[PDB]
Design a protein around this motif. Structure first.
Motif, short mmCIF file in Angstrom:
data_model
loop_
_atom_site.label_atom_id
_atom_site.label_comp_id
_atom_site.label_asym_id
_atom_site.label_seq_id
_atom_site.Cartn_x
_atom_site.Cartn_y
_atom_site.Cartn_z
N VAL A 81 0.85 -1.18 0.00
CA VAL A 81 0.00 0.00 0.00
C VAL A 81 0.89 1.24 0.00
CG1 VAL A 81 -1.70 1.32 1.29
CG2 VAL A 81 -1.93 -1.15 1.13
N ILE A 82 0.69 2.12 -0.98
CA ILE A 82 1.45 3.36 -1.11
C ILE A 82 0.47 4.52 -1.03
CG2 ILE A 82 2.93 4.73 -2.61
CD1 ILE A 82 3.92 2.08 -3.82
N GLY A 83 0.76 5.48 -0.16
CA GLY A 83 -0.13 6.62 0.00
C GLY A 83 0.59 7.79 0.64
N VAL A 84 -0.08 8.93 0.60
CA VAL A 84 0.44 10.18 1.14
C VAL A 84 -0.21 10.46 2.49
CG1 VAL A 84 0.72 12.66 0.69
CG2 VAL A 84 0.85 11.02 -1.19
N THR A 85 0.61 10.81 3.48
CA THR A 85 0.13 11.12 4.81
C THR A 85 -0.70 12.41 4.80
OG1 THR A 85 2.12 10.07 5.69
CG2 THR A 85 0.88 11.45 7.22
N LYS A 86 -1.80 12.40 5.55
CA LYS A 86 -2.62 13.60 5.72
C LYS A 86 -1.84 14.69 6.45
CE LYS A 86 -5.87 13.67 8.87
NZ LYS A 86 -7.13 13.35 9.59
N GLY A 87 -1.89 15.90 5.90
CA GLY A 87 -1.13 17.00 6.46
C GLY A 87 -1.79 17.60 7.69
N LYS A 88 -0.94 18.12 8.58
CA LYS A 88 -1.41 18.73 9.82
C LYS A 88 -1.02 20.20 9.89
CE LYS A 88 -1.30 14.44 12.52
NZ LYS A 88 -2.77 14.35 12.76
N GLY A 89 0.24 20.50 9.61
CA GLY A 89 0.75 21.85 9.66
C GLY A 89 2.11 21.88 10.32
N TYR A 90 2.61 23.09 10.57
CA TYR A 90 3.90 23.25 11.23
C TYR A 90 3.75 22.90 12.71
CZ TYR A 90 8.22 25.36 12.93
OH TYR A 90 9.44 25.58 13.53
N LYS A 91 4.36 21.80 13.12
CA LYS A 91 4.27 21.32 14.49
C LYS A 91 5.65 21.35 15.13
CE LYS A 91 -0.15 20.39 14.36
NZ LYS A 91 -0.39 20.98 13.01
N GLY A 92 5.67 21.18 16.45
CA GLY A 92 6.90 21.26 17.20
C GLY A 92 7.63 19.93 17.31
N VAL A 93 8.79 19.99 17.98
CA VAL A 93 9.60 18.80 18.20
C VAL A 93 8.91 17.85 19.17
CG1 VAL A 93 10.97 20.09 19.92
CG2 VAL A 93 11.94 18.03 18.84
N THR A 94 8.16 18.37 20.14
CA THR A 94 7.40 17.52 21.05
C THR A 94 6.20 16.90 20.34
OG1 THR A 94 8.13 18.90 22.89
CG2 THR A 94 6.27 17.44 23.30
#
Ligand SMILES: [Mg+2]
Ligand SMILES: [Mg+2]
Lengths: 153, 60, 394
Positions: free
Chosen positions: C218-231
RNA sequence: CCAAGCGUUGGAUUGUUCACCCACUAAUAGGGAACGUGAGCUGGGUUUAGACCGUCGUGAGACAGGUUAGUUUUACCCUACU
RNA sequence: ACCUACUAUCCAGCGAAACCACAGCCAAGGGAACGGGCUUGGCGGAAUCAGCGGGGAAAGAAGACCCUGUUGAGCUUGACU
RNA sequence: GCCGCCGCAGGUGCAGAUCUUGGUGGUAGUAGCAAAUAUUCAAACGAGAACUUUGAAGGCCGAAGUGGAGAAGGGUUCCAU
RNA sequence: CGUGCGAAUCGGUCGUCCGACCUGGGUAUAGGGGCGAAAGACUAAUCGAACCAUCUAGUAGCUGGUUCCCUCCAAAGUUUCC
RNA sequence: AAAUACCGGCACGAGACCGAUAGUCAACAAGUACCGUAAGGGAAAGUUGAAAAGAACUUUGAAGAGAGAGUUCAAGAGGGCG
């Protein structure tokens, strides 16, 4: 007085000036260098676009802390803002220059701006108060503007 | 145009606050050029200004 | 000094370029190798994730603690629309790399394929492929295609077919098709070219490409979230309450003598919208699309052997922000990478799948089709109305 | 021997580096990074003055002898990272 | 792990301060015995925006520690007058 | 208004001194315009109204008030054009 | 907050609140002196001896700097003493 | 009484002294403005044109601010104008 650029022909070309305007030096120089090489009808349409926030002015030299935008992709730059006050003062200046061309007896649609210059001016003196009793300035940066129109068919 | 003087004088004549005062908004330029308290008494006798009633507090 | 109470790290090294990719469709990195022993079939396929539901199946394996019992699992729904073929393309084996030779297009190029080239479909006057289709009604155009058949026989090794998804059957808002290269496993080059000429401008079935119970990729693109932090991205150990300059940051990043910083320490950046590749997914059921003959429609998809009914897999009140599955679907194990209305690539297995757990015929018993919105407790409308009786204005 | 690829815990006390005990596991092996490490946290003890007890100095004071509370400023500049 | 508000980000108007030999791609060697500049090897291909604190022996104060000066002050005694 | 020549005289030769005064830059259109809940429409003199005017609606301070008046203190800060 | 609204503010938060309770105006106490329920504690943003002027350009075996050109000659880190 | 001293004041003359950050701190409505509760401290500041002949007249524009004219040897001297 002695000017920066002498006119090639006094019959076709004309000049106008604006002194002591409360506008920013950097933004005024950038919009002057942007509007320096266009036709007068395209310049009025560009000022209508600035008023309606449709076409912005890209900042290539003084590029700091300005967010990116898509409307400046026509010029080929990421940053862009709308100098509305400087745009209104240069609109009044182009109106005064068109009246000078009317007083000289010149054509309306053949006028093309050729040169425009933003020179420095003596600054005002005011201040604000901060912590520990230390006076810090709140000074402005006014500028003098001169521009040249020329009939080129 | 500017009725902050006539509101204070109307509050001083009616001897209450300026909150419970209703002016006549029809002819502002005709009401504003008074420049005396005799014209204010004439407008009171004509009946344009109204002392607004007290906001009720029902003890039922 | 060294660490006294040791702990290695919390993070991945195989996915450290966390940048937003330029590509949109999940591209197959490693294609299956062809051989003359296998017949003609397709390697990869393109589909769209629709939903997710329960399953009831029989487990039969030797030696386990649970044997001959009934369990439930989570199974996917991937709608698999057929594709239209718009030709093939060759690839010569060069010592520098893998270079193509000539792209061959079909005669009747579909408008869903033409939407990919144009940016504005309304303003454009449709000027592409107007003089290129003049080669189909003259002798000079047919001799060019005949000489390319012998020229590509000698040098071109890999021949990938060009397909695009049929968006006309889907009632969705978009109308633009996704172009895709599919390598053909089969016999010789002449047999591959004859099969491509026979299957030119033909519908691609699902059952002939993928079958039952194969451990597919299965090949797919991860759903985007945005600019997130290191934690938020790396999920490391948090700082306690007694810290002054924040408690959700990385405390010690570098040192004195390593005056610079490297990518060994986990850093913040872009989270979401990345490429992934999942493996080992079991196929349970290849569903059938809607078909109407003599008025009476056939929708026996949720009807298993023990269902004793006749209804489709559509839940009560439709799907959640998806639409309706009009085409045929497939059902896989677990959860695939991606989201709703996201493109998905199904791929054949590269490794030789011979395992005791992954070789078992699944007895289809019951498929849970209820309204996932709210708290659904009914399978079908007639059963719900039989339970609830009459209404106010019946 | 080849061999650092992958692994090498929790708790009572001590401010503790160090040291001791218990339970467990696969081992609970040993170290460096300007005594790794504050514009990354913490001040428990040292390490400003206040007092207590004990010794010595007649005397202002001294005690590897203690007790107890004791103000921690700023990155928006450049490089490097993402 | 989640929510709200105040934040932060973009646009109209206005608009500082600190710092500043000059600039900030690296490793080894030596040195006033730990350099961004010297030599030899790797490299370096416009211009800006939101984070971060590793470095600029980051700014501060002719060190608040120690010693000396034939430098000064307070306490105290049976030092001297 | 000034130069050369013969003798004489100096407050007579600058790159620094955390030198003195004055002027101007990178920074930089950066940081910023966040202690205390809340405003929304119609018309208007005027070229020009997110901030001003009246008319309407919705609220806050809740008698220890975001109320009225005094003393110290300020000294026309009160009103008209 | 900590280049503040502020050259010592605000939130949670308290000790006390009919008696060793806070305090509005006039007056007494001024510098080797005064005041001090005793902390060299305070005495106008300054208290191990208040502010300003003079001696004072006090002293400094000690740091910091000390300005045109050309030509020739060309040094010592030591004997002894305080 | 006599020859002796004069840095302030009353009238002047002279100078190998200085020349607008210099010379008295102050060349001008300077111990003036200003700061400190006070004894006290203490500034910044010249050069229009010989002569104002200081710009009438047209136009843009609400006015500010421009574009043509006039004076004079020159605006190359445009109201903070060697
Ligand atoms: Mg649901
Ligand atoms: Mg523990």
């Amino acid at each position: 007085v002695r000017y920066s650029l002498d006119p090639e022909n006094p019959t076709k070309s004309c000049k106008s000036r604006g002194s002591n305007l409360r506008v920013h030096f950097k933004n005024t120089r950038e919009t002057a260098q942007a509007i320096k090489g266009m036709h007068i009808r395209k310049a009025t349409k560009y000022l209508k676009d600035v008023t309606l926030k449709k076409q912005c002015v890209p900042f290539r030299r003084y590029n700091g802390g300005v967010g990116r935008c898509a409307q400046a992709k026509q010029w080929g730059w990421t940053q862009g803002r709308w100098p509305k006050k400087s745009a209104e003062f240069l609109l009044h200046m182009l109106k005064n220059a068109e009246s000078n061309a009317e007083l000289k007896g010149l054509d309306v649609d053949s006028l093309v701006i050729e040169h425009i210059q933003v020179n420095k001016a003596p600054k005002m003196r005011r201040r604000t108060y901060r912590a520990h009793g230390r006076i810090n300035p709140y000074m402005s940066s006014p500028c003098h503007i001169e521009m040249i129109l020329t009939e080129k068919e | 145009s500017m009725l902050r003087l006539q509101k204070r004088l109307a509050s001083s004549v009616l001897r209450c606050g300026k909150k419970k005062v209703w002016l006549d908004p029809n002819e502002t330029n005709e009401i504003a050029n008074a420049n005396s308290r005799q014209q204010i008494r004439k407008l009171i006798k004509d009946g344009l200004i109204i002392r607004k009633p007290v906001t009720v507090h029902s003890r039922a | 000094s060294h660490r006294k109470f040791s702990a290695p790290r919390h993070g991945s090294l195989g996915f450290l370029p966390r940048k937003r990719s330029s590509r949109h469709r999940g591209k197959v990195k490693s294609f299956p190798k062809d051989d003359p022993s296998k017949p003609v079939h397709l390697t990869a396929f393109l589909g769209y994730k629709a939903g997710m539901t329960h399953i009831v199946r029989e487990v039969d394996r030797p030696g386990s603690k649970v044997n001959k019992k009934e369990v439930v699992e989570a199974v996917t729904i991937v709608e698999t629309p057929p594709m239209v073929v718009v030709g093939i393309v060759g690839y010569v084996e060069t010592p520098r790399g893998l270079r193509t030779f000539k792209t061959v297009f079909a005669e009747h190029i579909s408008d869903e394929c033409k939407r990919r080239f144009y940016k504005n479909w309304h303003k454009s006057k449709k000027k592409a492929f107007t003089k290129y289709c003049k080669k189909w009604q003259d002798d000079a155009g047919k001799r060019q295609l005949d000489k390319d058949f012998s020229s590509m026989k000698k040098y071109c090794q890999v021949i990938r077919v060009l397909a695009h998804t049929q968006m006309r059957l889907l009632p969705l808002r978009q109308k633009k098709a996704h172009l895709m290269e599919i390598q053909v496993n089969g016999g010789t080059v002449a047999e591959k070219l004859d099969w491509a000429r026979e299957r030119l401008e033909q519908q691609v079935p699902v059952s002939q490409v993928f079958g039952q119970d194969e451990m597919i990729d299965v090949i797919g693109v991860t759903k985007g979230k945005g600019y997130k932090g290191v934690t938020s991205r790396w999920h490391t150990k948090k700082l306690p309450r007694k810290t002054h300059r924040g408690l959700r940051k990385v405390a010690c990043i570098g040192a004195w003598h390593p005056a610079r910083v490297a990518f060994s320490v986990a850093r913040a950046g872009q989270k979401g919208y990345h490429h992934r590749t999942e493996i080992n997914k079991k196929i349970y059921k290849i569903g059938q699309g809607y078909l109407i003959k003599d008025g009476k429609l056939i929708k026996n998809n949720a009807s298993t052997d023990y269902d004793l009914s006749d209804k489709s897999i559509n839940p009560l009140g439709g799907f959640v922000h998806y639409g309706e599955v009009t085409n045929d679907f497939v059902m896989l194990k677990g959860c695939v990478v991606g989201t709703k209305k996201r493109v998905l690539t199904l791929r054949k297995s590269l490794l030789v799948q011979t395992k005791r757990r992954a070789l078992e015929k699944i007895d289809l018993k019951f498929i849970d089709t209820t309204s996932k919105f709210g708290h659904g407790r009914f399978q079908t409308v007639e059963e719900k109305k039989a339970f609830m009786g009459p209404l106010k204005k019946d």
